[PDB]
Design an enzyme around this catalytic site. Structure first.
Site, short mmCIF file in Angstrom:
data_model
loop_
_atom_site.label_atom_id
_atom_site.label_comp_id
_atom_site.label_asym_id
_atom_site.label_seq_id
_atom_site.Cartn_x
_atom_site.Cartn_y
_atom_site.Cartn_z
N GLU A 259 -4.50 12.78 9.83
CA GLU A 259 -5.22 12.31 8.63
C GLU A 259 -6.59 11.86 9.07
O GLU A 259 -6.72 10.76 9.60
CB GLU A 259 -4.53 11.17 7.89
CG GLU A 259 -5.20 10.83 6.56
CD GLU A 259 -5.24 9.37 6.14
OE1 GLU A 259 -5.59 9.14 4.96
OE2 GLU A 259 -4.91 8.46 6.96
N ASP B 47 -1.53 8.72 10.54
CA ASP B 47 -2.24 7.97 9.47
C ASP B 47 -3.45 7.27 10.10
O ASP B 47 -3.33 6.75 11.21
CB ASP B 47 -1.32 6.99 8.74
CG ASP B 47 -2.04 6.12 7.71
OD1 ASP B 47 -2.33 6.63 6.62
OD2 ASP B 47 -2.35 4.96 8.04
N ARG C 17 -5.11 4.22 -7.74
CA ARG C 17 -4.52 5.42 -7.09
C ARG C 17 -3.13 5.67 -7.65
O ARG C 17 -2.73 6.82 -7.64
CB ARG C 17 -4.47 5.32 -5.57
CG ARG C 17 -5.83 5.36 -4.92
CD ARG C 17 -5.69 5.16 -3.43
NE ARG C 17 -5.23 3.83 -3.07
CZ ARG C 17 -4.94 3.44 -1.84
NH1 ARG C 17 -5.05 4.27 -0.82
NH2 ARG C 17 -4.54 2.20 -1.62
N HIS D 274 -1.82 11.86 -2.51
CA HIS D 274 -1.48 10.48 -2.92
C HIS D 274 -2.76 9.66 -3.01
O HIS D 274 -2.71 8.62 -3.68
CB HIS D 274 -0.46 9.91 -1.95
CG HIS D 274 -1.05 9.46 -0.65
ND1 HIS D 274 -1.38 10.35 0.39
CD2 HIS D 274 -1.30 8.21 -0.19
CE1 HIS D 274 -1.83 9.67 1.42
NE2 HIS D 274 -1.79 8.33 1.11
N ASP D 275 -3.86 10.10 -2.39
CA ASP D 275 -5.08 9.26 -2.33
C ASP D 275 -6.09 9.73 -3.38
O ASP D 275 -5.95 10.83 -3.95
CB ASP D 275 -5.69 9.22 -0.92
CG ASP D 275 -5.15 8.11 -0.03
OD1 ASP D 275 -4.62 7.11 -0.56
OD2 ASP D 275 -5.23 8.25 1.18
N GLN E 19 -2.63 -5.58 6.46
CA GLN E 19 -2.56 -4.45 7.43
C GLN E 19 -3.44 -4.83 8.62
O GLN E 19 -4.64 -5.05 8.43
CB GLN E 19 -2.99 -3.13 6.80
CG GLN E 19 -1.91 -2.53 5.91
CD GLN E 19 -2.46 -1.54 4.90
OE1 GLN E 19 -3.43 -1.84 4.21
NE2 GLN E 19 -1.83 -0.38 4.79
N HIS F 43 -2.20 0.30 12.34
CA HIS F 43 -1.98 -1.09 11.87
C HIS F 43 -0.52 -1.29 11.46
O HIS F 43 0.16 -0.31 11.06
CB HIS F 43 -2.92 -1.38 10.70
CG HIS F 43 -2.90 -0.27 9.71
ND1 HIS F 43 -3.81 0.76 9.75
CD2 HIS F 43 -2.05 0.01 8.71
CE1 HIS F 43 -3.53 1.61 8.79
NE2 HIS F 43 -2.46 1.18 8.14
N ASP G 82 0.86 -1.21 0.00
CA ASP G 82 0.00 0.00 0.00
C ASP G 82 0.89 1.25 0.00
O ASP G 82 0.63 2.12 0.77
CB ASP G 82 -1.05 -0.09 1.11
CG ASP G 82 -2.07 1.02 1.20
OD1 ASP G 82 -2.36 1.61 0.20
OD2 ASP G 82 -2.59 1.23 2.27
#
Lengths: 646, 646, 646
Positions: free
Chosen positions: A327, A285, A521, A396-397, A253, A185, A142
């Protein structure tokens, strides 16, 4: 603005903790640590006691971690800590310009980043977010978000020594490194996970492990799906443990159990250790996900803020120089809590992504109407004045369409119709759409669709180049400069996404890479084109040149405008022309009125609102000229952006 | 609402006029006239004394004209006078529905019109304006507006005995005749003008005649051009007299001298004579033009209202049944004076064309936005409650874009750009315009352009039928029904223009009549199509039948909705959806909220508006059903009209 | 402004009524009656049909009554009828000043009144209410309100011939006679009651008679007591008939059964017969009470208004010149219904007592604060513009403290503590009170107290004369002139109470007349002092002269101020000085601002208010001088009254 005073009943715990500090530290050094410990103890304790059963005992175990990390902190970093305590609004200043990049995509390796500081400096960058660069699990990880070892840089990027040398070079140029803290995670291949798989009890308790489906099936009834195309639901069966494990994201994750004080201690230690390698900003995150409660979406739980408060206090005590950035890609009504409200007011992250602002820019670009953007931003609650939004157009997303039904309804829109239209539009399906975007994680059960694609491909540059129309090419670049103008002038740290200063298009390369091919993505995570950087700088009439010199001009004007200090918030103006977004920033030296034409057409705006905001002789800092007024109107060019003072 | 008391200083004048009345009239008859003269003498005197130097002398000459016209007034018209004095609000009633037509185009002759009374009654018509039917000059006479003899019907339409027989037929079916009073100007072939052309000083003073260019050159400096394509400026050289004569309109239309007490007595005589033929409503043609003042535009001068007040009082004394309709196609800011303000409050014309509502309907149709319409109509001053607007979508004339810069500027529009855009749109030149209209009287000196064309051709039906596009055919019919719904629902006498109930298109046959060819307004003055009328009644799904039945449905709902009583005015709602025009009419039985979608797209409207106006169970009188509320919103279909009560 | 149209279903009923009318009247006379019947039938019917079971057949019996009353109506009254139809705002004019007197107290006899018309005309009176002068029962008759014979004048006052000659003399000088219509109840000695008591069944149905307490006991549970000291509850046992009868007021005032159509017809006949003797205004005595309903307070019931609509239409048809005036001394939220609301809008009484204004004037004089007054009058609903308030400071009755809890609570007052204080204050009990008033009908169970006393005694003149302080005598006269200025200036018919123009004090005579001694309202029902009248005229420096000349000046200024036309309502200003009451009346010729200082000290008002209402050069019509403005303030003298225009 508010300091939490030391409650009487904690005088005895402070005494115990200062005695424990006395055994590690002496002199002026012990005194500096001791005064900081006293300042932040109230917030540190209030956080831990809401969550963990034995706060006093947990604080006794935490002390030597604070102490050892204090002992290990450099003279240079101690000097930055002291410098930032004296100027605590440093990150709120106009001079703060951020840049976001994957190390391998920007400059190959950490050491490679050293040779591109001259390029970051030319864009006035003072904040650099390198995407996760700690050792991940192999193959699909990821994009670094499946962490296998927090204490190691990914091999192909370099070593911890190279990180230390990079941070030393960034500090010498006044650049703050931002680093992900992937605290929700770990990769299933992480030691903690490996030890849990082998049936080690201590490390089973670092995770949410279930012997059968009875509890997971109940949890699932109120859980959404973050990645329904990759890993349906929120649990994965683990062969080796023979147990069901909570996996919100990819199935490799594994969600950490934040009820376990042992996990708090791992991250308090990890934050201070990375602070000491030179990390100045930690991106929390998936911060919204860290607390699980049956019958809830397991997001935005009160305990999230209690834990964040304890981690923030740890960083306050040992590394004053560091910031937290939340985030929290959440509903407009949920975001404000991540900057601290009620008992948490200003005691949480310093910054948070303004996802609502990013959504409303793209929505307004697609509709040519700013009423929803104006209403949603006007309804936004005020933040603590010691905090800042992080503003952005892309990252980035994928884009999630966080539109509240209440705000749409207030301006005569259906929430559901408009959310659907935004994915129809940005996927390029809507009639005459300028966008080349991709649907991401289409959920046939909820109707939710997200959008992948580069700023430049979404804003119409890809289509203009295919169709060869010079006018639509012009308009497309204008849309990008307008959108960047909003992120640069709203107030907040502007997060420039790598290659948007070159108008980089969609990169379909990822399709030929089996570890990326499933995750579109990657279409908006290109490699940097240094030949394009050289051409933009050398030829300002090229598309990349128009974007580069246009953005560089807005950055130079933004940092020369004290009215963009993020302690002050945009006060939204009534959109008297529904195509023109407007707000005022009330600075001690005077008012700034920002206007933004979200239309490809010429738009007229009532000049009286400039006078109403005390501007008798309006001057636009972007053009560097008087604002022409004719017949009581301001004439705005297509996608014009005006930063107006006296 | 307000009766003007008789000033102490006019008691002597009243006594002389009464003792003069006692010489013509006897018993109960003398009492009736005598009470009426008492009641209105105050308004009559105050009008005349503001304009003419010997008002008491002029009143003495007017008295035997009043008494003779009273004596010549039939028992039936006297009955109607008494009924209307008992119900002065009769013309304000929702049951009032008007039809406008040229006799020759509608039914060949005045006798012909008798056979079409069943057709009118089918449409609930209670008011019929037959276009100028008095003897015009030959050849071009501007469709009857160049009158050669006010005491003769144009020969091809019949005689004054036919006019008497038709008005008798109309009265028996509750229909009021509206006749033009062209009081600003006569044909150069009129007795007055011929006597003036031969050098009779007395009749030169019925006009504005100048021996050379000295006074004309000074007047022209502040005069606009009404027909720059027909007759530049405002003066014509007459060879026979040697004199420059004031000609605002066509060269053969001669402006009367309203400073002349004789002209006033001519028209006071003419009004009562026509009332006694059965004229119920006088259209004051070019009423704004009747007073000249050097250094002004010679429009809207105070004396216009003094004169109108005096002429109105004459009709009030002798023929209480008759109404005055002001033709004042003037700026938004100037229109309200024609229903009486200040010392003239409610003492002038009973009605006036709402040219601003008409302009705003077409503007909002072209732009799909109702903000300018909503603001211009919100700012409109309140009218005397004894008065009514005449609402309309089209008429025998071109459209003049009466848009005030101030209204445009308030909603972020350039008045100049928007006026220019409306002629660009409706001439068919704007990209994707649905309209087939023509430019009329393009003035290169001022940039002014007007538009000719039928409702059906401007609203897109012409284009749709030519391309055989069924979606555009549907949408064009819906735009016409929406437009008509606003004129039916605003409050006011709705002037249905002949054939619009059949969606008649542009008739280009005027290009081959050399007396019509130079005046493209004839494009929207078609002959009636009785084949199409029969097809429309027989076929509700034909384009003509959709219009015919759609319009009769709206008419039947209007008539059974007391909320449309014109004594009450529309209170404009904030256009919370900028595509949706909204207002409330506050009736004793309760509030009616009218919502109109000016977009070809589905539009959502905040449901809370309905509850804020006291509508707990909102019912749409047009659909005969409950208004569906979903997610706090009203879903409006393309060009939907709702008339909502509890 | 709204004429109720004839529903189709009633057209047959109109033809039968017209045919019955054709048997009684002929020619132009029949036409005049026929048109008035047609115009008001729809209101007449809609009123009867909501109350009586066979409306169609009740109208057939009513018709001959109408027809006969029409034929008996003199030419002079018919002329007045037609004059008033032409000018229906006549009673709303500034020139309307009213005077209210008992005949025997003012001039001895009806004949005597003729000799005092000079006095009435010197005060500008155009409306004379003579208190109940019809034949009452002997001894105690509630000052004429227990009527033995509607068809006879009280013997000591003269005959119907004297009334007829008095109304002729009054008409000659433009004065309208107001007569009480005591329609709720008759004396027990009345012929209808006498017939009921001897068991005549048709006249038992004219009252509310019960065999025993079964029903009365249940009615009483939700009934208030009007005169608890005189006649507890609402029922009296009649020994002759052996039955309980409804007696709201005194035991010998028997409440009529308005459910019985014969009672309707008796009053329809009586109104027209009284009108034919020259009564121009009917005071509907106790109109609130005329409908009974178990489990309600038997006030304000919807049938009251339907019966009123029906009686009003009767008067419209046969006697257009007559007005109805409602006596509705009700709560603030209930008053507006008596001017016609919902389906009764403006179809009821032409006028109603403004008891809330009267109450608020005295409340404000007591507290020196106008905020309760400003709020209560601000919240007051808008009346129909064809109606008028009757304004008054005092009258023949006690003061009931009609204050809504909601109004008091909005301005930070306890409703119940403030009503208690008003009776504490005006009874003279409150410390430093200037009032000499008496408690009336103190109800121990309820706490309700009313107040008797003369304007001058309540306002402090009696105390001032006792204390001999010339400054308190001055302030007393100023309070009376301030109060009168509000009743003259608010908009409506000002009801001057006989003697208030001389500042007459409490008359304690009544304690010597056993028939009056129990009823302390006789304290403010004095005999006119004609020696005092002459002294007031001859000596302007006397107390009676300062009042007479002060009041005559306010009247003369009101008469010549068009802004006081009652079609316009006072728009209440924020009381920005809480001692100064303010409103604007928005006349076509310009705004009038009225400021009233309710304090005995100098008060300053913000001058910006006058420019805000369009007054650049504020002129005070009362002083006949410019309003002095100094330091953005208007300086108001103690109890100052300003009527300010440009």
């Amino acid at each position: 603005m508010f300091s939490t005073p030391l409650p009487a009943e904690l005088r005895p715990l402070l005494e115990r903790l200062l005695t424990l500090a006395q055994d590690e530290l002496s002199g002026g050094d012990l005194e500096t640590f001791s005064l900081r410990l006293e300042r932040y103890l109230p917030d540190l304790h209030a956080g831990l006691t809401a969550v963990y059963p034995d706060a006093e005992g947990l604080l006794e175990r935490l002390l030597p971690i604070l102490t050892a990390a204090h002992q290990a902190r450099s003279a240079d970093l101690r000097r930055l800590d002291a410098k930032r305590l004296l100027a605590p609004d440093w990150f709120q200043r106009p001079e703060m310009i951020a840049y976001v990049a994957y190390t391998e995509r920007f400059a190959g390796t950490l050491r490679g980043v050293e040779e591109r500081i001259d390029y970051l400096e030319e864009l006035g960058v003072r904040y650099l977010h390198l995407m996760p660069f700690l050792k991940p699990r192999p193959a699909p990880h990821d994009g670094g978000y499946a962490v296998m070892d927090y204490r190691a840089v990914r091999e192909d990027l370099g070593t911890m020594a190279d990180l230390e040398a990079l941070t030393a070079k960034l500090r010498a140029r006044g650049i703050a490194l931002c680093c992900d803290l992937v605290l929700n995670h770990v990769a299933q291949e992480h030691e903690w996970a490996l030890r849990a798989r082998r049936g080690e009890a201590k490390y089973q308790r670092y995770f949410h492990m279930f012997p059968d489906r009875t509890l997971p099936d109940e949890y699932e009834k109120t859980l959404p799906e973050v990645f329904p195309d990759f890993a349906p639901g929120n649990f994965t069966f683990d062969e080796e443990s023979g147990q069901w494990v909570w996996t919100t994201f990819n199935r490799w994750q594994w969600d950490l159990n934040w009820a376990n004080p042992e996990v708090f201690l791992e991250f308090a230690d990890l934050i201070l250790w990375l602070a000491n390698r030179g990390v100045e900003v930690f991106r929390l995150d998936a911060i919204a996900f860290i607390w699980k409660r049956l019958g809830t979406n397991c997001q935005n739980q009160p305990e999230v803020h209690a834990i964040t408060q304890a981690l923030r206090a740890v960083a306050r005590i040992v590394a004053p120089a560091v910031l937290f950035k939340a985030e929290a890609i959440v509903a407009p009504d949920d975001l404000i809590h991540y900057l601290g409200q009620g008992p948490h007011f200003g005691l949480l992250s310093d910054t948070a992504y303004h996802n609502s602002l990013m959504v409303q820019i793209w929505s307004s670009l697609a509709s040519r109407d700013v009423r929803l953007m104006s209403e949603a931003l006007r309804r936004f609650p005020l933040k603590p004045t010691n905090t800042a939004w992080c503003t952005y157009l892309r990252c980035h997303d994928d884009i999630g369409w966080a539109i509240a039904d209440e705000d749409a309804a207030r301006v005569g829109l259906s929430g559901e119709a408009h959310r659907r239209f935004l994915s129809d539009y940005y996927s390029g399906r809507f009639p005459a759409s300028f966008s080349r975007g991709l649907v991401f994680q289409e959920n046939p059960r909820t109707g939710d669709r997200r959008i992948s694609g580069s700023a430049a491909s979404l804003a119409g540059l890809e289509q203009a180049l295919e169709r060869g129309d010079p006018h639509q090419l012009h308009l497309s670049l204008e849309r990008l400069l307008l959108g960047h103008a909003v992120v640069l002038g709203f107030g907040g740290i502007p997060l420039l996404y790598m290659g948007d200063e070159l108008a980089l298009l969609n990169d379909h390369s990822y399709l030929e890479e089996p570890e990326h091919a499933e995750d579109n993505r990657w279409v908006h995570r290109p490699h940097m084109d240094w030949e394009k950087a050289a051409r933009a700088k050398a030829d300002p009439t090229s598309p990349e040149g128009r974007m580069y010199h246009g953005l560089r001009h807005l950055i130079r004007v933004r940092r020369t405008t004290p009215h963009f200090h993020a302690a002050l918030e945009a006060q939204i103006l009534e959109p008297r022309n529904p195509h023109v977004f407007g707000y005022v920033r009330r600075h001690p030296l005077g008012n700034l009125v920002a206007l933004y034409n979200f239309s490809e057409e010429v738009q007229y705006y009532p000049a009286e609102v400039l006078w109403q905001q005390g501007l008798g002789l309006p001057f636009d800092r972007i053009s560097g000229q008087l604002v022409p007024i004719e017949h009581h109107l301001v004439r705005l060019e297509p996608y014009a952006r005006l930063w107006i003072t006296d």
